Ligand binder design. Structure first.
Ligand SMILES: *O[C](*)C(*)(*)(*)(O(*)(*)P(*)(*)(*)(*)(O*)(O*)=O*)C(*)(*)(*)(O*)=O*
Ligand SMILES: *O[C](*)C(*)(*)(*)(O(*)(*)P(*)(*)(*)(*)(O*)(O*)=O*)C(*)(*)(*)(O*)=O*
Ligand SMILES: [Mg+2]
Ligand SMILES: [Mg+2]
Ligand SMILES: [Mg+2]
Ligand SMILES: [Mg+2]
Lengths: 436, 436
């Protein structure tokens, strides 16, 4: 039984406060921490901020913390809920807020309670978190599937100062035989990239963005891609490493057009692209580089653009801001054949139950699912256990630099070790890892 | 009783492998992870690397890990050691290696077990880590002293690409009334700094170095310091925030002189300074800025330069590479009056026991002690509990950006909360926190 529910303010990877929750049971104290995005889709569940410009630059979470402590806590403990019953847990929480967007208590007040209960339940059951998550999701566990890590080695958009519009340039070692191998390979590529980047664009170019990737000040995707393929080759991994993109196009969508100079306050409107024009740009990239996944190619409500591009795209198309880990939205995307992959962010929806449903619905439609961190991460490692539980075969949790990234990557090495032969590595089967 | 000793490879904050150790007892599994420096002193205990250029660029730790699993492990379990007896743990470890610089086993193999044992001990005693650390160290806990966090908000030297020679530019909110306040103020200064830096030196200048500080490509310390001052004022914390420096001068000491353009392969030898000329620069900075602490002003063996400068310094002078957390070297520095504070790094010496001895010897000499992370950190939080346990009153564990940094800072917030009125904040008494 839950004897205490408590929250506190802690700091994220960027130096902004976030919510940390602890749940106490007869099994101990279970702690979960809420992540925070930067390029947040307009449809995400509410992240409650204090908005007091005089403290934390207006980003405190005292209100959210207070909602946990003064609203949720006593009520939750009184309720005497069965932590093992995730659904019951989330039902209680959702009910307590009573809003569609969790704007009453805030998504960042709900989430940590949701996640912490799951940790508690795993403890009650005496099983590892990933196994409990496979249980809650009714996922197959024989064998378990370890994900290919999509490492964001070169950062742009809203994640790094510089002119580069596209947000993320990831490498995925789909050719590795094990997760450990993939991580080694990814780290080697990363070091080579850092060195080539300083050489080609200047010492400052090697300094990092929010997600740990290098941050050269360049105007085009080709300049980033060229560096990456060069790094793969220098590292000796040609053919084992593929590329993924996160366009985060909503960040540059204005006036029905797409601004690839969006970070320039005086950007030339005459240069903004139409949806078709942008699609042609992407096709150029696809034909040239070993890109196997493109995320958020069009804006979060630009349905027609997505559907149109989708019929011509011969690779994984990931929905992020389009879907916001929301089953309702996913259903729209599925019917419209807008994408074939969901980017899963527990904090975009606010509860673990909802997130799991999002995953299930996606898998039911033949889509893939890439579990993801936020640009504002913490020392929390939930998502590592989550992507294994969910059997997705793919995760994005950063470059192999900045510990809020490595913490998940390290957790995955521990999981692998623990499972041994009871797990396979998704490798080239990443898209449908759940069906392995 | 310890039933198992095990080690595995994990990744540090820069993407390099490091050693992670787990000790299993009646109480559970206790994990400790080893950090890795960049600007490592020539006299530091040996960090064992594999040197297989085909794997991790030669940076693997498989040998060290194998040392723990195949050499330390069996002997250690067989010995049936009392984890609560830290000296016995350490003597055992030291003796097993039998080398002056822990080059047989590797200091990175030894340290993980040393630390993991202390965590095991604390659990056996049913006390929080920091309390056990206070016990091991014969420290006073009534009250405990929370440290002033020295935040490395602007990075240079070997920690960030760019021209800037001195390594670190730290802010220290000695005017805060609580640790939580100090951290808030610090973060706010940091945000103001990032924005000012992008404006003054360009967008890329806001990207970060290894320790999470902003990384402007500037030639001089005054340029860095002006930014900091400007940020402090902008944040509204004028008078509550002081400055600390880490010169890491050994990194630019060549042919008996100091190269302030050491990262330029075509640096002007005619511009390299002598010890006295360097001291002149320091005095000028100290006059101009609210600097309360200077670390590694002169090279690791340039005794006379230290000795001379110290005569008229008048602020805290921290020894890092000069002492390498080594009591023998500390004895010298005390004898020559070279400095008045020790930078404490468990991995410079290799055992918790020798590190506690170093601290004790320092405090006994009237010196201060600043507990420190390495530039290559992990999600491990040991140092947070250590600084509190040793009651030093001061720690440096990065900018309030990059979770390998926030993890510690968050842990101190937790400790502070736990302690409540049983603890005081060092504030302006940071130098002699132990005597508070
Ligand atoms: O890379 C994670 C996420 O960025 P946020 O967290 O929204 O700034 C993305 O868009 O995939
Ligand atoms: O900032 C910590 C340390 O840097 P390393 O770890 O040696 O690269 C220093 O010199 O104080
Ligand atoms: Mg986003
Ligand atoms: Mg995205
Ligand atoms: Mg150093
Ligand atoms: Mg130093």
């Amino acid at each position: 039984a839950v004897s205490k529910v408590y929250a506190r303010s802690v700091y994220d990877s960027r130096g902004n406060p976030t919510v940390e929750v602890e749940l106490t049971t007869e099994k101990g104290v279970f702690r979960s921490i809420v992540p925070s995005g930067a390029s947040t889709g307009v449809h995400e569940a509410l992240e409650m901020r204090d908005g007091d410009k005089s403290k934390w630059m207006g980003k405190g979470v005292l209100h959210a913390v207070k909602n946990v402590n003064d609203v949720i806590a006593p009520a939750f403990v009184k309720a005497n809920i069965d932590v093992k019953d995730q659904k019951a847990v989330d039902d209680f929480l959702i009910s307590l807020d009573g809003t569609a967007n969790k704007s009453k208590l805030g998504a960042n007040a709900i989430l940590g309670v949701s996640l912490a209960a799951s940790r508690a339940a795993a403890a009650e059951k005496n099983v590892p978190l990933y196994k409990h998550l496979a249980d809650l999701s009714k996922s197959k566990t024989s064998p378990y599937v370890l994900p290919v890590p999509f490492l964001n080695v070169l950062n742009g958009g809203s994640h790094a100062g510089g002119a580069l519009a596209l947000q993320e340039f990831m490498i995925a070692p789909t050719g590795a035989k094990t997760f450990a191998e993939a991580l080694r390979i990814g780290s080697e590529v990363y070091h080579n990239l850092k060195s080539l980047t300083k050489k080609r664009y200047g010492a400052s170019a090697g300094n990092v963005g929010d997600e740990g990737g290098v941050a050269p000040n360049i105007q085009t995707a080709e300049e980033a891609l060229d560096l990456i393929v060069d790094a793969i080759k220098a590292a000796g991994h040609d053919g084992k490493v593929k590329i993924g993109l996160d366009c985060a196009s909503s960040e540059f969508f204005k006036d029905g057009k797409y601004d690839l100079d969006f970070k320039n306050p005086n950007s030339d409107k005459s240069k903004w692209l139409t949806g078709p024009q942008l699609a042609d740009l992407y096709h150029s990239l696809m034909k040239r580089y070993p890109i196997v996944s493109i995320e958020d190619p069009f804006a979060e409500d630009d349905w027609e653009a997505w559907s149109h591009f989708f019929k011509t795209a011969g690779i994984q198309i990931v929905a992020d801001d389009l879907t916001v880990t929301n089953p309702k939205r996913i259903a729209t995307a599925i019917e419209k054949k807008a994408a074939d992959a969901l980017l899963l962010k527990v904090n975009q929806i606010g509860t673990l139950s909802e997130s799991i449903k999002a995953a299930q619905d996606s898998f039911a439609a033949g889509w893939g699912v890439m579990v993801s961190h936020r640009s504002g991460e913490t020392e929390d490692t939930f998502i590592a256990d989550l992507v294994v539980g969910l059997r997705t075969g793919q995760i994005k949790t950063g470059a192999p630099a900045r510990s809020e990234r490595l913490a998940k990557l390290n957790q995955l090495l521990r999981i692998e070790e623990e499972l041994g032969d009871n797990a396979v590595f998704a490798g080239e089967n990443f898209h449908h890892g759940d069906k392995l």
